[PDB]
Design a protein around this ligand. Structure first.
Ligand SMILES: [Zn+2]
Ligand SMILES: [Zn+2]
Ligand SMILES: [Zn+2]
Lengths: 111, 49, 85, 42, 64, 129, 49, 147, 49
């Protein structure tokens, strides 16, 4: 995640300081320079499994269109719960369904 | 039969069902008559053909 | 559907492990396959690193531009390709 | 009150038909056109 | 790579249309303009987002 | 959304007005456009607070009143619609709802005739709304 | 900084560990083939390919 | 709108817009700046709403990088007015105003046609581009045109 | 008999579903878990009919 300058509102561009040989966070339309906590500059992944458990909405318990289920709820121990599958459109999506309860809203896998 | 509606082929079925009938299996025959869902799946196939 | 009908050698044609070896050698492979995750670091120290995911590994391994080009590979996929990192 | 039979639905349909008719939407849009469209465009 | 542009732009001095030649030179981020009739030239910094139309706009903003 | 649903159900808002809430997308779209299409639907009362829960709002009283065609203190189709027993649905509205493909199907059922079509099992979800 | 990411992206693709290029995948296929037999008749023969 | 740049090809994953009565595409940041929000912080706010989505941030990053030359509404506008498909010789005097006109008029007229609600246009544009980026990530289904 | 066969086939399909959903259904060559699932289901239905 990349952030901007608080007062200049322009993007912080991390420029090296060879004299101290450290990482910084330097804007360009201003001169506000701040130290970089982690020497990481940019990070990118190849295999993505993020967003499968981050696409959660609270009011999902109020939808009747979704099927109900007697799948025992790990937390609320109810026997009337809905279940669905990840929203990811990747061709290789593995359909280990994200069973969701009326209350817990937890993406639990009982496998 | 695909999910022409969001996450389901028909509003009369729940979301995320996969039973044979739930995605376009006909169990009846013409003599037995066709329930509306299987009728519609057959109609889709015929239009396609 | 571009494809090739390939006939192996007589001994291989009746053999399976040799056939798999020949397939693996033939099937095209790249780092992207075995590559898993990449992480660009400004590692100021040419002689060491300030990231612990490899700190001990570099210490036992170590015994210019300071910016670090660090990446991760996929062991499961790496061995799927009959190769080691 | 009791369960709703099928002929209940058929008479439902008959009443709906008698109100609206087959050309209902046709006359509706034609009337709304003559009513509001002309002045709005003018 | 230099790109001579014998454009259709009309220059204000000799008032001849298609007399403006907008040769863009991004090497130094510095533009170049030429006329084949009165030989007037214009200068303006050129970012990665400047075009002969933008150059002509800068010329009008500068001369007049 | 419940409030506006009931608002249109009374007839306060035009039935043609389409009201769609997207739970997953955290979106709420309302349409009142010309050129939209719609078809009627029975309203299965689904509130978990009364007997009509999972049951039709329409009743044989409305049937009698229509057979009269008058109101027993004109009682027409639009009267049924306005009373809140009958709603339309456009193509997009059809998606976010669960309909009972037959009046029988509203009540969860409990035979073996070779001269008839076959109804669905409907067992994957022990609960229906 | 930008040079480092350019190098990262450049290497991400331009390193082929093994295999003939242009071959996304290969399949281990078995094959039956009629084979003349020593006595003179023909014998089919399951064989990898 | 269109997601310029291919996956690690075409340089960054940039985006440029297509407009009525124009002849060229423009970086999306530029049209944001000509509409009032020159800073990229407001642009990202109106566009990205889950800052945790660093992936969104880095797909838009080339768009942000390329959006540093324009820093105010007038340069963004004359820039835009330079590509307004109009005649030759409008000069910055009227070019900026014509650009602002086409930013207001001919642009999302169904949203607003008067002044003072270009902020509404910015918010709606940010939402639309957010949908575009979600689709590029393909975390959601492409809107079935047959629906 | 037809109904018993249909019940058995639908049971096969349901067991295939329980198989795939618990991340237990084997992958077909060059054909995804979703695509393998679809193929197995289709084969089961063809066998049933
Ligand atoms: Zn700044
Ligand atoms: Zn629960
Ligand atoms: Zn001249």
């Amino acid at each position: 995640s990349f952030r901007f300058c608080l007062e200049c509102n322009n993007m912080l561009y991390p420029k090296e300081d060879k004299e101290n040989q450290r990482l910084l966070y330097s804007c360009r339309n201003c001169d506000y320079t701040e130290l970089a906590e982690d020497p990481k500059v940019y990070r990118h992944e190849l295999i993505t499994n993020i967003g499968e458990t981050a696409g959660i909405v609270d009011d999902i318990g109020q939808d009747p269109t979704l099927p109900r289920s007697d799948k025992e709820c790990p937390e609320c121990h109810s026997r009337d719960c809905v279940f669905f599958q990840s929203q990811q459109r990747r061709k290789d999506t593995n359909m280990t369904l994200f069973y969701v309860c009326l209350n817990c809203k937890k993406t639990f896998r009982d496998e | 039969i695909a999910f022409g509606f969001a996450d389901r082929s028909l509003p009369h079925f729940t979301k995320d069902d996969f039973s044979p009938e739930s995605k376009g299996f006909v169990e009846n025959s013409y003599l037995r008559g066709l329930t509306p869902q299987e009728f519609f799946f057959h109609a889709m196939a015929g239009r396609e053909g | 559907t571009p494809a090739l009908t390939v006939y192996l050698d007589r001994e291989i044609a009746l053999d399976i492990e040799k056939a798999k070896v020949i397939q693996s050698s033939i099937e095209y492979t790249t780092l992207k396959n075995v590559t898993s995750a990449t992480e660009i670091y400004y590692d100021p120290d040419p002689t060491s690193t300030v990231i612990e995911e490899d700190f001990d590994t570099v210490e036992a391994y170590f015994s210019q531009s300071p910016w670090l080009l660090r990446l991760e590979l996929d062991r499961a996929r790496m061995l799927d390709k009959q190769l080691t990192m | 009150d009791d369960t709703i039979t099928t002929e209940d639905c058929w008479t439902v349909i008959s009443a709906f038909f008698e109100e609206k008719g087959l050309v209902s939407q046709q006359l509706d849009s034609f009337d709304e056109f003559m009513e509001t469209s002309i002045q709005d465009l003018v | 790579i230099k790109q001579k542009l014998e454009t259709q732009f009309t220059c204000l001095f000799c008032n001849h249309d298609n007399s403006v030649v907008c040769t863009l030179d991004k090497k130094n981020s510095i533009g170049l303009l030429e006329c084949k009739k009165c030989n007037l030239s214009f200068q303006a910094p050129i970012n990665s987002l400047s075009q002969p139309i933008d150059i002509y706009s800068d010329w009008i903003d500068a001369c007049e | 959304v419940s409030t506006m649903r009931d608002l249109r159900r009374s007839g306060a808002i035009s039935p043609e007005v389409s009201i769609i809430r997207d739970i997953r997308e955290r979106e709420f779209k309302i349409f009142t456009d010309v050129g939209r299409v719609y078809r009627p639907l029975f309203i299965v009362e689904d509130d978990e607070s009364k007997d009509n829960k999972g049951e039709l709002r329409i009743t044989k009283e409305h049937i009698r009143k229509i057979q009269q065609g008058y109101d027993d203190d004109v009682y027409g189709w639009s009267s049924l619609v306005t009373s809140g027993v009958i709603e339309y649905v456009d193509g997009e509205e059809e998606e976010t709802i669960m309909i009972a493909m037959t009046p029988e199907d509203l009540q969860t059922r409990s035979l073996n005739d070779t001269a008839k079509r076959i109804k669905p099992e409907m067992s994957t979800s022990s609960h229906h709304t | 900084d930008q040079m480092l990411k350019r190098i990262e992206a450049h290497m991400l693709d331009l390193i082929a560990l093994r295999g003939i290029p242009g071959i996304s995948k290969v399949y281990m296929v078995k094959h039956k083939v009629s084979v003349p037999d020593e006595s003179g008749e023909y014998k089919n023969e399951e064989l990898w390919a | 709108i269109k997601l310029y740049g291919r996956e690690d090809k075409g340089t960054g994953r940039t985006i440029k817009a297509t407009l009525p009565y124009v002849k060229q595409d423009i970086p999306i940041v530029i049209v944001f700046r000509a509409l009032g929000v020159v800073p990229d912080g407001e642009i990202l706010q109106h566009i990205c709403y889950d800052e945790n989505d660093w992936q969104m941030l880095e797909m838009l990053k080339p768009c942000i990088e390329e959006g540093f030359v324009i820093q105010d509404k007038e340069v963004a506008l004359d820039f835009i007015g330079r590509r307004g498909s109009a005649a030759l010789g409008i000069r910055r005097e009227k070019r900026i105003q014509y650009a602002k006109d086409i930013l207001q008029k001919e642009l999302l007229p169904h949203i607003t046609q008067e002044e003072g609600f270009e902020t509404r246009k910015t918010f709606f544009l940010g939402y639309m581009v957010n949908r575009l980026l979600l689709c590029a990530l393909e975390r959601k289904d492409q809107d079935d045109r047959d629906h | 008999e037809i109904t018993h066969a249909i019940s058995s086939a639908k049971e096969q399909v349901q067991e295939i579903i329980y198989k795939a959903q618990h991340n237990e259904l084997e992958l077909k060559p060059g054909m995804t878990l979703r695509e393998s699932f679809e193929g197995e289901v289709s084969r089961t239905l063809n066998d049933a009919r």
